[PDB]
Amino acid sequence: RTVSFQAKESMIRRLEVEAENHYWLSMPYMTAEQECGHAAERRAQAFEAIKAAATSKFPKHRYIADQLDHLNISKKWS
Template sequence: MKTHVVHDVCERLATSCLLRPWTHSAVIAVIKRKHLKQLDLIYSAIMFLTLSLLRKGIPGKQWIGKYRRPRQITWQMKCNTLKNLEREAENEYWISRPYMTREQEHSHAAERRAQAWLKIKENKFLNFPQHKHMTDHLSHLRVTKTWSS
């Protein structure tokens, strides 16, 4: 089937839906001769147009689902996307160039890390309780013990 035939059928469908009821079988008879793939497109267009005309709107949620309405891309969306891409490109540029050489980077923070570890250990030992002996735990048993008994 040639594109001008499909275009003609769609044009006739759009004008006739507003003027008189359009039967699905007439469209199917025109299109079914060669291409069944285009049949689905035309049939879904007929159903969508019929539902939107009869029910005053699109059935269901129009922004979610399999047959959702595509969101229009605005000028501001394009500008924001360009800004994000430029920012990402600049970040990649700066990340790709190292600040220090490998020799400078090797163990450059060893002393700072050792001091930080010592500080952490000291803070742990500050909260550590005092040592207790067994005599401290059992001293309550010797209350009545005297030298004479």
């Protein structure tokens, strides 16, 4: 086969973008040690929400109003 002109250019443009991706990933703002523990409080709160939802399942209330409202099916003009 012969690679078409379009295919060669399209690949080059994608190569150039990835080159810039390499550059912007080379300058970390914080070192590893500084990072440790900086977000502990937020993470712990999140699981507490998850656990609370899991252990909250229970049946629903039942009301006299629902059962007795069925009688209105026979309402009329007297």
